[PDB]
C-alpha cells in the first residue's frame, strides 16, 4: 500500500483528520485507511481499533498544506470530505476531528470580534449572556415582533433573536422588521441603561441580498446580526464575517440542518469539526447545544467542543473527543450559545457547566411567567446573577443550586412567580 505509511511522522504543517470507519467484512482496516488516504497525496499514518465496537477503527490521515486554498473553509471541506462518504468499501464512515496547523490558521480572518472584544463592546463582564427567541415562531407582524422584542429586552435580557426560519416573508418583510426591532432596541436601551441587541437574521437567497441586509443593520447602528452557515454555505458565511469585521458588527451563527450531518454516530461529520470550520470561517456566537430537560449529549463531548471553540490551545484528550492538539495561534474565540428550555431552577447546572463565557438562550420564548414577558426576563436575569454570585463565593452549584435559587426568590417577587 503506497498510501498506508505507519512509519510516517506528520509534519508541523499537515492537516490531520481522524476518521472513524467501519469497513465491509473481508476488507482489512489497512486497505480501507489506504483508500480514504488515496508529494500531494494524502496518507494514512496511523490506524487504531475502537475498543468496544466490532470492526471499528480510527484512521489518521495527513494532508500536505499545499493541497488547500488559503482562508477557504469551502475548499477544505471539498478536499477532506468531498467524495469519501460514498466509498462502497466502507459500511460507515465518520469524520471525528481535524488538526488545523497554525500555518493554515493564520490564513483565516476568524471571528469578527471574538469573546473578549464582544465583552468590551457590550461592557458586560463576569456573567453569562441571556437571550430569547421571539415567539410565536411565524405569523407575527413586524410591529408586533418589535413589541415582543422590546418587552423581553426591557426585563433584563441582553439579547433577543429572530426565529431561524424568519428571513423575509409576505407576513413580515425584512426591512420593516429591522426598523421596528431597531426602535425596540433603542427604547429598551434608554429605559434600562444597558446596551441591548437583537440577532437580526441576514440569511438570504443571494450573497447580494445578505450583504444588503447586513448593510441595513449597519445603517441602523444596531449591534448584531445572525446567519445560518450550514444552509447559507461557508462561502456566504465568510463574506458576512469579513463584512462584519470591516463594519464593526457582531455575528451570531445558527447551526440549521446540523443534525442531518452530525446526529448518527456511524456516519457523518462530528459537530466539533463543524464548530472548528465555523471558527475558521467566522462567527462571534455559535448555537452549540440544546437544554431540553437538561444539557443533552455527553457532558465531556460538549465540554470538549466548547473548549475547542473557546480556548487558544486545546491539548489532545480522547476522553472529551479531542483527537489532536489544536493550536489556534491567537485566533479570536467563539462564544457557545446553549438554547432550549432553560428553566429557572436549571440555571445553576448550566452556569456550572459553561461558566461566564457563554450565552444562555430561552428559545422557548419564556412566556411561562404569569405576569408577562418583562418580569419573566427579570426573573431569569435575577436567577443568573444570583447563581453567578454564589459561584464566585466558593459555593458548589451542583449541590446548592436549589438553595441559591430559593434564597434569591426570598427577595425577588418576579422570581417568586417564576419559581412556582
Amino acid at each position: 500500500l503506497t498510501y498506508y505509511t505507519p512509519d510516517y511522522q506528520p509534519k508541523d504543517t499537515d492537516i490531520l483528520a481522524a476518521f472513524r470507519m467501519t469497513p465491509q467484512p473481508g476488507v482489512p482496516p489497512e486497505e480501507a485507511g489506504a483508500a480514504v488516504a488515496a508529494r500531494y497525496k494524502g496518507r494514512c499514518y496511523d490506524i487504531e481499533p475502537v475498543p468496544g465496537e466490532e470492526n471499528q477503527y480510527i484512521a489518521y490521515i495527513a494532508y500536505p498544506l499545499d493541497l488547500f486554498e488559503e482562508g477557504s473553509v469551502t475548499n477544505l471541506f471539498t478536499s477532506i470530505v468531498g467524495n469519501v462518504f460514498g466509498f462502497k468499501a466502507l459500511r460507515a464512515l465518520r469524520l471525528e476531528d481535524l488538526r488545523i496547523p497554525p500555518a493554515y490558521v493564520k490564513t483565516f480572518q476568524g471571528p469578527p470580534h471574538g469573546i473578549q472584544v464582544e465583552r468590551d463592546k457590550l461592557n458586560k463582564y463576569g456573567r453569562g449572556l441571556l437571550g430569547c427567541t421571539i415567539k410565536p415562531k411565524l405569523g407575527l407582524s413586524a410591529k408586533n415582533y418589535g413589541r415582543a422584542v422590546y418587552e423581553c429586552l426591557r426585563g433584563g435580557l441582553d439579547f433577543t433573536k429572530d426565529d431561524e426560519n424568519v428571513n423575509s416573508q409576505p407576513f413580515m418583510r425584512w426591512r420593516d422588521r429591522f426598523l421596528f426591532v431597531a426602535e425596540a432596541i433603542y427604547k429598551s436601551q434608554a429605559e434600562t441603561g444597558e446596551i441591548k441587541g437583537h440577532y437580526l437574521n441576514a440569511t438570504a437567497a443571494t450573497a447580494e441580498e445578505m450583504l444588503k441586509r447586513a448593510e441595513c443593520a449597519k445603517d441602523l447602528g444596531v449591534p448584531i446580526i445572525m446567519h445560518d452557515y450550514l444552509t447559507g454555505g461557508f462561502t456566504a458565511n465568510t463574506s458576512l464575517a469579513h463584512y462584519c469585521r470591516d463594519n464593526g458588527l457582531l455575528l451570531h451563527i445558527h447551526r440549521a440542518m446540523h443534525a442531518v450531518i452530525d446526529r448518527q454516530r456511524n456516519h457523518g461529520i462530528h459537530f466539533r469539526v463543524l464548530a472548528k470550520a465555523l471558527r475558521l470561517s467566522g462567527g462571534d456566537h455559535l448555537h452549540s447545544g440544546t437544554v431540553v430537560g437538561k444539557l443533552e449529549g455527553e457532558r465531556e463531548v460538549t465540554l470538549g467542543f466548547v473548549d475547542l471553540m473557546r480556548d487558544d490551545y486545546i491539548e489532545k484528550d480522547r476522553s472529551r473527543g479531542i483527537y489532536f492538539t489544536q493550536d489556534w495561534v491567537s485566533l479570536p474565540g467563539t462564544m457557545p450559545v446553549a438554547s432550549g428550555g432553560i428553566h429557572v431552577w436549571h440555571m445553576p447546572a448550566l452556569v456550572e457547566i459553561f461558566g461566564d463565557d457563554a450565552c444562555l438562550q430561552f428559545g422557548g420564548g419564556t412566556l411561562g411567567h404569569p405576569w408577562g414577558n418583562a418580569p419573566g426576563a427579570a426573573a431569569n436575569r435575577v436567577a443568573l446573577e444570583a447563581c453567578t454570585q454564589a459561584r464566585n463565593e466558593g459555593r458548589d452549584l451542583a449541590r446548592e443550586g436549589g438553595d441559591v435559587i430559593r434564597a434569591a426568590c426570598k427577595w425577588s417577587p418576579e422570581l417568586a412567580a417564576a419559581c412556582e
Binding site: 468590551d120 463582564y125 463576569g126 434600562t192 441603561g193 444596531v222 464593526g248 457582531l250 464566585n392 463565593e393
Partner: protein
C-alpha cells in the same frame, strides 16, 4: 405585576441583586484576587453614568458598537483594601455610582465589572421590591 419603566436604571453585573453589603463586596473582591486578577474602582456621577449617543452626531458611515459613558473614571491587594477605597470614594464623591473592575494582568484584558454603590441622592433606580408595580 408590571416591570416599572420609570426610574428603573441598571448597571450590568449584579445590578439586579439587592445592594451588596460590605461582606459581600469583600467576598467578590476576594474572588477576583483569588483568580490572580487586579481589582480597581470606577466611579461616575449621574450625568455620565448611563450609556448615551451624545457623540454620534460627529460620526458618519456607521455608529455600530459605539456608545458613550462606557468608560468611567478610575479611582489592590485584598478585599479589605478595596473596601477601604470604596469608603474613601464614597466620602469623596457621595453622588457618584462606584463600580469594582477586575483586570487579568497576563492577558491585559478586563475580566470583571460590578456596581457596588448607588448614590442615595440620585433616584434613577428602583429597589428589589419596587422594580414591579
Amino acid at each position: 405585576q408590571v416591570w416599572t419603566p420609570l426610574n428603573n436604571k441598571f448597571f450590568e453585573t449584579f445590578s439586579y441583586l439587592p445592594p451588596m453589603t460590605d461582606a459581600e463586596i469583600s467576598r467578590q473582591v476576594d474572588y477576583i484576587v483569588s483568580n490572580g486578577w487586579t481589582p480597581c474602582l470606577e466611579f461616575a456621577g449621574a450625568e455620565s453614568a448611563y450609556t448615551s449617543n451624545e457623540n454620534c452626531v460627529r460620526m458618519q458611515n456607521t455608529t455600530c458598537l459605539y456608545y458613550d459613558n462606557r468608560y468611567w473614571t478610575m479611582w489592590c491587594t485584598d478585599g479589605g483594601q478595596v473596601l477601604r477605597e470604596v469608603q474613601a470614594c464614597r466620602r469623596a464623591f457621595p453622588d457618584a455610582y462606584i463600580r469594582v473592575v477586575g483586570f487579568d494582568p497576563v492577558r491585559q484584558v478586563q475580566v470583571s465589572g460590578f456596581l457596588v454603590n448607588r448614590p442615595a441622592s440620585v433616584r434613577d433606580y428602583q429597589g428589589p421590591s419596587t422594580r414591579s408595580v
